[PDB]
Design a protein around this nucleic acid. Structure first.
Lengths: 110, 97, 50, 85, 122
RNA sequence: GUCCCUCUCCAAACGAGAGAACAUGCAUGGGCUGGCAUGAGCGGCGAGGGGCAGUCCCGAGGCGCUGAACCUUGAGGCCUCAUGCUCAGGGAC
RNA sequence: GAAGUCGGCAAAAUAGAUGCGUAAGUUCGCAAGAAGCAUUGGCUCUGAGGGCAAUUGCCAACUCAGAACUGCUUACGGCGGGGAAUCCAACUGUAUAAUUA
RNA sequence: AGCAAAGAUCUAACGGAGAUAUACAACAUGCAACGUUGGAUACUGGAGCGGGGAAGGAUUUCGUGCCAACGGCACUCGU
């Protein structure tokens, strides 16, 4: 059982998720894909995009969105006081990298 | 809280419109509790409200093209979109003679 | 506009005073009928043409 | 490069003239023909001269992977992998 | 512009000549040199930087002496018979600080009519 | 045992269907296969031209590294060729 | 490639600028952008077109033409299809606001 | 039925009753939506969703509070 507070980084292949999507929807829809992509592998809701990852998706505008992204994913544990069940959340942040080829996915041992 | 009042005065004090006024997102408790012009210029002085520089419109790409085009480079036959008389009126040439 | 006769200015001065709501105590008069002011007004509808 | 959307045919197969209804991947049944078969067209011995293995992605101009490596030969990613030696 | 220009004459552009005498600029490095963030090395590199990268007519790295570059004391001076803009030496300094990546730290600002002063940020 | 939630696409307006159920299933990577047409960077052929006295520069193109760079399954190409994720599946009759 | 259809309706087409060229008819004004042909980039040069001061010296702002080399996947926006004739009104104009211009 | 002209929003922190709302871990059991500030992206494109006046309106102006009704969706915003 992998612990709480695990930080791993991975490539999302965005070009396949956005294929044939209406241009005016590319950037805003690419974010819902990353929250849904990260969300299901970390198995949390409330996935949070840093400015570093937001601006990377938008820097070419709404139409052109980069075909791939490396993201660093830090889950942490925070619950409000009187909740019955634990509440996690993740911080998805960009990791600028020149190439992509060869990188795969690996957990940062922190 | 709504800083809509302070941002209305800091824009009228700085002589800038919005897109140039900067309210410090950290100190937002201290920007509110400025209810008056005398109290806002105390924020402009203390660095919690700044006027940002104009966005850059650079004329240089046009300075390079001007020099090239002063050697005669880009005015050809295919780059002329208007009548000769409109580019150089034959009347202005004969007044010059 | 900026222009106005003074005679016309006052007619709007009176009509601005008359828009106030019915005082709270005046509901408590013994044998009272008036509840909310029925003559109230808003410039968006029913325009005085003075 | 395989049959598009299908992959390599590992097991024994029937090869059958003409289109068959249904897309790739779907189960079908071949049944012994009911219509009476006496005719030149329907009684014949089929002898195939050639079978086209060229890629169905794009225009395949090569029949085998060897025919391709002859038209190219040494190549930048190949000049590299020998340096692993 | 009277004689029309040529490309290919962009090598060796004439610069206006100061007919009265010498002009002298200063770059005051005292403050950061004191704290060790500069060293005798970087001051040897800072003078050399201007020695290599100042461009006299069209070209850089070759300064005959119409301009002299002196490290006397801790303050750099540039004495010039040519007409330069002082703005231009504020330019080269910033361009030096960004190779050393000192530029988030050391800022330059004009203390006197002929001089700049390296300092620190609040 | 069936249905929902979840994942796949021979199905599909929504239902329904075919399926999967810790499964190379999903993810990314590699290699195939294919498209385009030789990337950025740097370096000694070029109509002409400019300095200093042959050199050192300005110059569209060009040549070399370079069939290179990039893209290649996604409404959903191939190959387990590698690693990564899963840690009592939840709920309803 | 108009066979469509009441009918080329709708769409396509034409297209900038420069040079050459341009019919019948005519109230001699036009017709006329008639029709039609050709040129166009990028780059490095060359010529011509001036002001001012005392033949000489110093300077600004642009336009046009010509050449060599090199490139085209014919590649933003914007922007006329044209010709042969008949009927009617000479022309510009006005005119049924909400079926007739 | 429909609420389809005028391109378009996104992210974080803070606000707010509007939540991270649970009788043998987290997704599978609190969804969607609001304001302000910072950042990003985009539109208007000087014949402007720019700045001022007439006719007409007449307190819509301004500050604080506030969400019953009203702004054909939503407001914590508002004429």
């Amino acid at each position: 059982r992998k612990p709480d507070a695990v930080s791993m980084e991975a490539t999302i292949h965005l070009s396949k998720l956005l294929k044939k999507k209406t241009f005016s929807k590319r950037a805003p829809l690419a974010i819902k894909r990353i929250k849904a992509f990260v969300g299901r592998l970390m198995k949390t809701k409330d996935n949070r995009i840093d400015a570093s990852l937001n601006t990377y998706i938008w820097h070419k505008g709404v139409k052109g969105v980069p075909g791939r992204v490396r993201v660093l994913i830090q889950r942490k544990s925070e619950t409000t006081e009187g909740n019955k069940h634990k509440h996690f959340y993740t911080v998805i942040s960009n990791v600028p990298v020149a190439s992509f080829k060869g990188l795969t996915t690996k957990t940062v041992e922190q | 809280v709504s800083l809509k009042l302070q941002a209305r005065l800091a824009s009228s004090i700085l002589g800038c419109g919005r897109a140039r006024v900067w309210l410090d997102p950290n100190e937002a408790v201290e920007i509110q509790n400025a209810n008056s012009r005398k109290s806002v210029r105390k924020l402009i002085k203390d660095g919690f409200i700044i006027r940002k520089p104009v966005k850059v419109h650079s004329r240089a790409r046009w300075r390079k093209m001007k020099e090239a085009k002063d050697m005669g480079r880009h005015n050809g036959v295919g780059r002329r979109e208007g009548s000769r008389e409109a580019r150089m009126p034959s009347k202005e040439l004969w007044m010059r003679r | 506009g900026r222009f106005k006769p003074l005679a016309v200015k006052k007619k709007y001065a009176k009509k601005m005073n008359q828009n106030k709501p019915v005082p709270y105590w005046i509901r408590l008069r013994t044998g009272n009928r008036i509840k909310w002011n029925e003559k109230r007004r808003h410039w968006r509808r029913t325009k005085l043409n003075y | 490069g395989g049959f598009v959307g299908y992959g390599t045919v590992r097991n024994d197969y029937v090869m059958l003239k003409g289109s068959v209804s249904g897309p790739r991947r779907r189960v079908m049944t071949l049944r012994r023909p009911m219509a009476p078969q006496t005719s030149r067209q329907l009684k014949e011995k089929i002898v195939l001269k050639f079978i086209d293995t060229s890629s169905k992605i794009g225009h395949g101009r090569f029949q085998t992977k060897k025919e391709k490596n002859q038209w190219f030969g040494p190549l930048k990613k190949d000049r590299i992998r020998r340096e692993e030696r | 512009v009277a004689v029309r220009a040529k490309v290919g004459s962009r090598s060796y552009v004439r610069q206006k000549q100061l007919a009265k005498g010498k002009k002298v600029f200063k770059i005051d490095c005292s403050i950061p040199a004191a704290d060790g963030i500069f060293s005798e090395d970087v001051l040897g590199n800072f003078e050399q930087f201007f020695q290599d990268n100042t461009k006299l007519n069209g070209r850089k790295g070759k300064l005959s002496d119409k301009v002299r570059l002196s490290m006397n004391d801790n303050v750099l001076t540039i004495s010039t018979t040519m007409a330069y803009r002082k703005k231009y030496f504020k330019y080269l300094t910033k361009k030096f600080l960004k190779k050393k990546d000192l530029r988030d730290w050391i800022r330059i600002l004009a203390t006197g009519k002929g001089t700049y002063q390296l300092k620190y940020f609040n």
